[PDB]
Every structure is written in C-alpha cells, then in structure tokens.
Amino acid sequence: DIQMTQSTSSLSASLGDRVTISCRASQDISNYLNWYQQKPDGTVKVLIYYTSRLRSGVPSRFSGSGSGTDYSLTISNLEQEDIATYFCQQGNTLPWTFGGGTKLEIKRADAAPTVSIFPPSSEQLTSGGASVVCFLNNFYPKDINVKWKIDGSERQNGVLNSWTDQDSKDSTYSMSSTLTLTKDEYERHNSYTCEATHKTSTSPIVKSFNRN
Amino acid sequence: EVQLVESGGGLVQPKGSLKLSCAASGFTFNTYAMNWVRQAPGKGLEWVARIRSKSNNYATYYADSVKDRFTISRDDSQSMLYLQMNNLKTEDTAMYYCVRHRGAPLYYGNGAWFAYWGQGTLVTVSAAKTTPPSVYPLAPGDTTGSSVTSGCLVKGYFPESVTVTWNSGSLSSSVHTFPALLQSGLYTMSSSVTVPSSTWPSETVTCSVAHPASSTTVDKKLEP
Numbered sequence: 001d002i003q004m005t006q007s008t009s010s011l012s013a014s015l016g017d018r019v020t021i022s023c024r025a026s027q028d029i030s031n032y033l034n035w036y037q038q039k040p041d042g043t044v045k046v047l048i049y050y051t052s053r054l055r056s057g058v059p060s061r062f063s064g065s066g067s068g069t070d071y072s073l074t075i076s077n078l079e080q081e082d083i084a085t086y087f088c089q090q091g092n093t094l095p096w097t098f099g100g101g102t103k104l105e106i107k108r109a110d111a112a113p114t115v116s117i118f119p120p121s122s123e124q125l126t127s128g129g130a131s132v133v134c135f136l137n138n139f140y141p142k143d144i145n146v147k148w149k150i151d152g153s154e155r156q157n158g159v160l161n162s163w164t165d166q167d168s169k170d171s172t173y174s175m176s177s178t179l180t181l182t183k184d185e186y187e188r189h190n191s192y193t194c195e196a197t198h199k200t201s202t203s204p205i206v207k208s209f210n211r212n
Numbered sequence: 213e214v215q216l217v218e219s220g221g222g223l224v225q226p227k228g229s230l231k232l233s234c235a236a237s238g239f240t241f242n243t244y245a246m247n248w249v250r251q252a253p254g255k256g257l258e259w260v261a262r263i264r265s266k267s268n269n270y271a272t273y274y275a276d277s278v279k280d281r282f283t284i285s286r287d288d289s290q291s292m293l294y295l296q297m298n299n300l301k302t303e304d305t306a307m308y309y310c311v312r313h314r315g316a317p318l319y320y321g322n323g324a325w326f327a328y329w330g331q332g333t334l335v336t337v338s339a340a341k342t343t344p345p346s347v348y349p350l351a352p353g354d355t356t357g358s359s360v361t362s363g364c365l366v367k368g369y370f371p372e373s374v375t376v377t378w379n380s381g382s383l384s385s386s387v388h389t390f391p392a393l394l395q396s397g398l399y400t401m402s403s404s405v406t407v408p409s410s411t412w413p414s415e416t417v418t419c420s421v422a423h424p425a426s427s428t429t430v431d432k433k434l435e436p
Contacts (some may be wrong), residue, residue, distance in 0.1 A: 135404050
C-alpha cells in the first residue's frame with residue numbers, strides 16, 4: 001500500500017492568514033491526490049480532487065498543488081468556518097489510502113473562563129455516590145489548570161477532566177472537572193472548592209460551596 | 213441534494229457478525245461505484261471496501277485487514293448499499309460511512325475519490341454488556357448573576373452513543389457537550405447550557421438523554 005504522510009497533526013493560525021498543509025506519498029501517485037474536510041461534528045466533504053481541481057460549491061480560498069510524491073493544500077485567507085481536520089487521500093492504486101489528518105485551530109483574543117460548581121444531586125446521593133462537578137466555559141487559549149480543594153486541602157484522586165473541541169462559532173474551549181467520591185467520604189468534609197488558573201489572570205477564579 | 217443514510221451499527225461481541233445498510237437518494241445509484249470508509253475513535257479515515265456498477269460487473273475490493281471477513285453488496289432496485297461484517301475484532305470498532313465514488317473518469321479523472329459521504333453509524337466490538345445511563349441534574353448549590361449555567365451528568369452507560377438535548381432542542385445556542393470518558397468498563401459525560409437568569413427557574417429547563425443501544429430516554433427537569 002501507499003503510505004500517505006501529512007506535515008503535522010495540528011496547527012494554529014489567525015483569521016485572515018494563509019495556511020498550507022502538506023502531504024507526501026511513499027510512491028509516485030500521478031497527481032491522483034484529493035483533499036477532504038471533516039468538521040468537528042464528524043461531517044466529511046471533498047474540497048479538492050486530482051491535485052488542483054476545486055470541487056463545485058467549495059470556496060475558492062481553497063486550492064491545491066504538487067506532483068509526483070509531494071502535494072499541498074492551501075487556504076488563502078482563513079475563515080471562522082474552517083475549524084476542522086484536513087485529510088489527503090491517494091486514488092492511484094488500491095487500497096486507497098489517507099493521510100493521518102491535520103487538525104486546524106483558529107487563534108483568537110484571550111478570554112477568561114466562566115466557572116460554575118455543582119454539588120452532588122440528591123438522586124445521586126441516595127444511590128450511594130457523590131460527584132462534584134465544575135464547568136470551565138468559553139475560555140481561550142486552551143491551556144488551563146484546575147485544582148480541587150476540600151476544606152483548604154488539595155485533592156488529586158478521582159478528578160477527571162474533559163475538554164471540548166474548539167467551538168466553531170467563537171473559537172473558545174470549555175472543560176469539565178469532575179471529582180468523584182464515595183458518599184461517606186463526601187459526608188466527612190464541608191467546603192468544596194474548584195480553582196482555575198488561566199493566563200488571562202494572575203488570580204485564580206475560585207468557585208465554592210459548603211455542604212452545610 | 214445527495215443523501216446517504218447508514219444504519220445497523222451497534223454493539224456486537226468479538227467474533228460476532230453484523231450487517232450495515234445505507235439508503236441513497238439524489239443521484240442515479242446504479243451508475244456509480246460505492247464505498248464504505250471507516251474511522252476508529254480518535255483516529256483517521258480508512259477506506260474499507262468498494263463495489264463497482266453493474267456495467268463493471270459489480271467488481272469488489274477490500275482493505276487488507278478486512279478481506280475475507282467483510283462482504284460489500286448493493287441492491288440497485290432499492291438504491292441500497294450493504295456491508296456484511298463477520299468475525300469481528302476489537303479493532304473494527306469505528307464509525308462507518310457510506311460513500312459515493314466520483315463520476316465519469318473523463319470529467320473527474322481516473323483516480324479514485326469520494327464525492328458524497330453519509331454521516332455514519334457507530335460499530336462497537338466489545339464483550340461488555342449494554343448498560344443504560346444514570347442521569348443526574350446539575351443545578352446551582354449560590355449567588356445569581358446575569359446568566360446561569362445548568363447541566364446534566366450522564367453516568368454509567370455502554371456503549372458510547374448518547375445524545376443530550378435541552379428543551380427538545382429549542383435550546384441549542386449555548387450547549388456544551390463534553391466528550392465521554394471511559395471510567396473504565398463504562399462511559400461518563402456531562403452537558404451544560406447557559407441561559408439568561410430571567411429564563412430560569414421561572415420557565416422550565418429539561419435535558420433529554422437518549423441511549424439508542426438500550427432504547428432508553430430520560431428527561432430531567434432541573435430543580436433549584
């Protein structure tokens with residue numbers, strides 16, 4: 001089979017910038033190289049076929065080039081709706097093969113997270129479980145640190161973090177932090193605190209509740 | 213507009229068998245080659261199989277890892293494409309897409325490419341058992357500001373495919389779906405929504421959680 005290799009698995013650029021994504025084949029593919037876009041929701045469409053032919057209905061800011069084993073996709077000015085993963089694909093010989101994909105992130109102005117904390121629900125408490133949940137929403141850039149404090153004391157165990165995709169409309173990220181405890185472990189403490197440190201501020205954003 | 217709708221995906225035991233279908237419209241099905249392409253969770257696209265038109269004797273071809281275990285077929289009278297999958301391995305776990313080949317080589321080149329894609333159907337090959345989710349509301353414990361953020365915690369389900377909607381989808385603008393994580397044996401995720409404070413709790417806000425693999429639907433109203 002023909003191995004297809006993309007330049008990077010990820011890159012980041014600003015609105016209005018020109019971006020180029022490269023693709024190399026392990027054997028000559030006679031210009032039979034095609035490019036696809038996969039939106040974060042999973043939807044896939046073809047952009048370019050036969051190296052350089054723009055697919056009808058696809059904006060002309062997309063273009064392609066190359067020959068032999070070396071090919072490129074270029075987006076001449078980056079728009080908001082271009083957040084996606086880009087894939088090349090050789091159609092010269094079976095089995096038809098794809099590159100590993102290049103994820104494209106859009107740069108934007110820094111934004112502080114909005115933080116919300118939530119105690120374990122009653123329904124959950126009765127079932128013998130205790131999950132404390134923290135949402136850190138609509139922040140940029142992606143890098144963020146969350147600490148859990150129980151009665152002033154940091155906890156590491158049973159904390160699970162999950163980030164969203166870059167959101168297609170405003171280019172922010174969100175994340176959830178979930179601290180899972182036993183009910184009787186939850187019941188032995190009072191103050192539960194979620195602290196987020198992000199480049200937008202020297203001071204952590206602190207959110208807190210008392211079990212009373 | 214070309215449409216491709218796949219079905220039949222679901223949980224199946226290793227060494228099991230499963231049959232995918234795809235329904236097509238918006239083009240002349242019997243003049244095109246058709247394909248299946250797949251994508252393992254967090255991985256890239258992989259071509260699986262191809263079947264040509266009747267004029268080209270319905271010639272089939274397969275990816276190396278699926279040859280001799282998968283069969284691709286078509287029913288032109290119903291505009292349907294199928295994939296019979298046998299002796300399933302854990303590495304067959306993936307989203308499977310029905311895909312229409314490019315048209316006439318004279319105008320589009322001899323090289324293979326994939327003109328139209330379905331949205332896909334999920335196949336999970338695992339010995340684990342179907343388990344419905346527990347759905348816990350996430351309501352403030354707390355001082356009110358100009359907005360308010362509510363959530364639903366969805367815990368303890370398998371396999372991975374739940375949809376969370378808010379007020380039957382009438383609330384869509386500020387919804388965040390956090391990817392599911394394996395606990396392990398079993399998946400967890402939450403979903404959040406932000407509304408103006410005037411909206412809640414005066415008006416009602418309900419999150420609906422569907423888990424097709426277990427035909428479960430739960431609607432949870434958020435208390436204050």
